[PDB]
Every structure is written in structure tokens, then in C-alpha cells.
Amino acid sequence: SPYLITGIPKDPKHPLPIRKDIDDWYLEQTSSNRIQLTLFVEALTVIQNRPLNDQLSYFRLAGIHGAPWTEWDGVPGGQKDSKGNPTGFAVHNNYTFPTWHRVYVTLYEQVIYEAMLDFIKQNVPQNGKADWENEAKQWRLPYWDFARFARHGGDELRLPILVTMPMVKVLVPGQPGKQLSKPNPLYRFQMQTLMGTLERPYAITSQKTEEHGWSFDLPFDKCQSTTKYGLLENYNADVWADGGQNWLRANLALNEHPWYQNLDGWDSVPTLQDMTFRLLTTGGLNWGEFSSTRYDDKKEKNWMNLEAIHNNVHNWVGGFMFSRPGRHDLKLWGAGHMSSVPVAAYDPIFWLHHCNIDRLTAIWQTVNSGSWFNDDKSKVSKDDDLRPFHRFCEKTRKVVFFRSDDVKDWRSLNYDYAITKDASRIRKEISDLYG
């Protein structure tokens, strides 16, 4: 420490590699080689199995966001949210929501790439290194396009293919023709014990949430594994230890789009795809309005801001009803990690979601040049330190925290998105995907 966040280093043979749609990428891989898939699976597996005292373990990286609310990279915890409760470093309900998360996703991608290089050095024979290093240097964190209809070989939105597979096949380096089935590190994350009993100070507690005006303590302390919808009130806690990846219910929620906001008076109740379309194409919006639920409290007009859409998708992926609803809403009963700020980052889909939130931000920036922390509301937050993320400042030759202006051009972090490559094409592509 400090861990200096840069994005994957620039290699002249690999100009601005793209973050791809994780379903397109998965099909590309499994149509037509499996080297990037193998690298991602093997590297993330290593990262997930690193110990708690390693701040580049999966648990500690996920820990930056929320619970257990500890230090990271020499930056102390002890932060409080608006309710006065313990909270993480993540920015929610402020205009730095997109930029804090832009750095967070790049940290994750960078840590994964560094683990891929270690993998290659240790497992790929000389004859194969050039090719495998080429693939690592081209790889970027895929995004989950939650607003794009899934292909058939599409009419509905879905969690990623790879997220729904408990096992995945990878290559055996230096044994061309050979493959192995391994547990898929994108399917879930689990510790070796209930997360509530981890050594101090890392234990994950239950998390108090409101449902229909009443308080419930979501039993995340009783989980060994992350779950989607697997936690239900008055179920045996042995079920809670691993409540499953109930991906059919997440898919149901995505297509039923039960927005939590009051849409009384709206022109229509949009689908998730249409709400995303409106976000990207409504004219005349400023950075404050686009970026955060903070801009307009009482909205928590025929369009919804980035953070509010993102909040709904979190709920719909993780499950947002622990207590049993009325009979007419039983089809969506169940709670899980992605709906809960303190523990959502433990679910590996968190990062894929946030990769698309970053992509949506980049699209919006592209077609709203100049709208950046400069309205009357968001200007105060422009120069906030994005703790706990450190970088080396070239000008001054100092270690400093990231600030939002440092990541205004996401290309400075050495990744891009296909959709933002050609500004002559982007408006057509937005209509093709989401209109």
C-alpha cells in the first residue's frame, strides 16, 4: 500500500481495448477460442481464494463498497450514512455516484488483469506465452447489458448466461485439446464459514431494511454464500446458508419491472429497456439530473435518472422482499445480496452491473458533451476525493486520491466501449439496441 490504480497498462500493440457485452463475449469464447474465458475464470478464482489479510482478495475488494465497514489501502473506515449508521466508501445519493463507481470497477478490472499475468507466468508454457499474454492484454471487464434483449442462439431481458451456470469449462494451458469443468466464480461468492462469524473486524452482520413501512433484519450474517432471492422470513437458517442463485425469479423481475418509485401521472410505465432508452435520449438534462437521486428528492418526469434505474436493477437481481408479501405478489418473494447496499458487492454480478452503469455514463457523456459537475447543484461535489482510491499524479509526482475530473475521459483508464468508438454511429446504435 498504497495500491496505485491506473487501469490496465498501455501496450502499443493494444490500443484502447473494449469492454464487451458479457453474453456476446461468452458466445465468442465458446463458439473461436476459450483463452480469455479461461483467464477470467482462473484469475477470479485466485482472487476469491486470497485471505482476508490480503487487501486484493475478493472479500476485501467487495468490502470497499459496504460491510463490514473496515479500512482499505490505509484509509480508515468509520463512515456514517444519512441515518447515522455505519457505511462503506461507496457513493450513493450524490452526484459523484457515477465517478466513484467508475474508479471502483477499474480497480476490479486491474486486479483481475494482474492475476491473469501471474496465471500465465505460472501455467502457460513458453510456446504459448505470446498468445496468452496477447489475450490478457486485450481482455477488459465485460458488461451486463441489462437493457438489451438476450439473443436466441431476442424478446426478453436476462441475467448473463455465464452468471447462471454453476460450472464452466476452461482450457488446460499447454495441453491443447484438453479442457476442464470448474466451479464458476461468476455464479456466486462464498466464504468457508458463515459470513457472520469471520475474524474481527470482518464479520458481516445482519442488515436492517424497511419493507412496507416495517423493519427487518436481513440475515446476511447467516449466509455462507451470496444468494439471489434465497432469503425468506420464517425459513430455517440452514436454508439461508446458501439460498441459491434463483435466476428465474431475477429474470421475471427484470421483465415485470416493478419500479419502486411512484409513477403516478406518468405517460406510461416503461419497461427497463425503454427506461434505459429514455435515459440516453432525453434532451436538455444536466449532470446533476442524470447522475443521482440527490437532484430531486420528491422523485424518490417520464424519465428516470441513472442511479434510480441502477437501484431498481439491484433490487430485481438480488430479491427485495424478505417478508412474505400479499398473495398477489408471491411470485417475486425472496431477498438476496444485490438488493442490499451493505452486501451487494459480494455477488459477482455486482461488477458486471456496474460495468454497464459505467458504459451508460460514457454513452450519456458522449451525447451530452460539456454536462459535467457544472450545474448549480452538482458543482459542489466536483472536487470530492473519491476515497479510498489512490493514484500517482504525474504533474506533481504525488500520491493523491482520485477525483471525478481524473476519470471524465474513461479512455485515460485504457478501456473503451464499442458504442462510444464512433460518435457518428452512437445515436443509431442506441435506437437499434434500446428503442
Ligand X SMILES: N[C@@H](Cc1ccc(O)c(O)c1)C(=O)O
| 228 and 286 Cβ atoms separated by less than 8 Å | no
Site string for ligand X, 381-400 (x = CB under 6 A): --------------------
| 12 and 137 Cβ atoms separated by less than 8 Å | no
Q: Which of 45, 37, 48 minimizes the C-alpha distance to 162?
A: 37
How many residues does this entry show for the chain? 435
Matching residue, cell 435466476: 247
- Residues numbered 91 to 130 that lie near ligand X (CB under 6 A) are 92
Cβ of residue 426: shortest distance to ligand X, in angstroms? 26
Between CA 168 and CA 187 the distance in angstroms is 10
Q: Which of 344, 360, 362, 430 binds ligand X (CB under 6 A)?
A: 344
Q: Which of 102, 249, 314, 390 binds ligand X (CB under 6 A)?
A: 314
Between CA 388 and CA 356 the distance in angstroms is 22
Q: Which is nearer to ligand X, 137 or 314 (CB)?
A: 314
Q: Which of 2, 333, 368, 377 binds its own copies (CB under 8 A)?
A: 333
Does position 241 bind its own copies by CB under 8 A? yes
Cell of 136: 490478457
Considering only the stretches 147-155, 373-381, 394-402, 424-432, report the one whose residues sit in contact with its own copies under the rule CB under 8 A: 147-155
Q: Which is nearer to its own copies, 237 or 423 (CB)?
A: 237
Site string for ligand X, 245-274 (x = CB under 6 A): ---------------x--------------
Q: Which is nearer to ligand X, 139 or 146 (CB)?
A: 146
Q: Which is nearer to ligand X, 48 or 339 (CB)?
A: 339
Q: Which of 239, 285, 400, 418 binds its own copies (CB under 8 A)?
A: 239
Between CA 372 and CA 365 the distance in angstroms is 8
Cβ of residue 143: shortest distance to ligand X, in angstroms? 16
328 marked ligand binding residue = no
- What three-state secondary structure class fits 10? coil
Matching residue, cell 433484519: 217
Q: Which is nearer to ligand X, 47 or 335 (CB)?
A: 335
Q: Residues near 91 by Cβ (< 8 Å), separated by ≥ 6?
A: 97, 100, 101, 386
Q: Which of 102, 149, 114, 24 minimizes the C-alpha distance to 357?
A: 102
Residue 434's alpha-carbon distances to 3, 147, 159, 248, in angstroms, are: 38, 7, 17, 22
14 marked ligand binding residue = no
Task: List binding-site positions.
Answer: 65, 92, 101, 310, 314, 354
Binding site for ligand X (CB under 6 A): 92, 260, 311, 314-315, 339-341, 344
Task: List binding-site positions for Cu(2+).
Answer: 65, 92, 101, 310, 314, 354
